[PDB]
Homo-oligomer: A and B are copies of this chain.
Amino acid sequence: PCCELITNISIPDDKAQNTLSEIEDAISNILGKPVAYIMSNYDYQKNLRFSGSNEGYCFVRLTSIGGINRSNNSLLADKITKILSNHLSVKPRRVYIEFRDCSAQNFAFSGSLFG
């Protein structure tokens, strides 16, 4: 399970860490789930373009996060848009939020299985 922010906007490490921490709090809160083993990341891609433009843009991708459905997906997308427009000064119209569920298509192993 991953929440990745892929963006051409540059922000310092402490603020990035705070931004992801806020998003993780939002997923937990809106979804009503503990997310004890979520991965997240701020992937700075300076050359990223959207619609032919290298202007500020944030793509957020949520993969295999259990518990997203009609009653909450938009609510989660709204809150992540707010956080980013707040912290990053990106236009909301240059935020795009995608949810995908790959849980059943992949095999996953923790290193803790092997000693």
- Give the B-binding residues of A (Cβ under 8 A): 6, 13, 16-17, 20-21, 24, 35-43, 45-52, 54, 57-59, 68, 70, 73-74, 77-78, 81-82, 84-85, 90-102, 105-115
Contacts and interface: CB of A to CB of B under 8 A. Distances in A.
Contacts of A95: 110-111
B106 A99 contact: yes
A111 to B, nearest CB: 3
A52 to B, nearest CB: 6
Contacts of A96: 39, 108-111
B111 A100 contact: no
Contacts of A84: 111
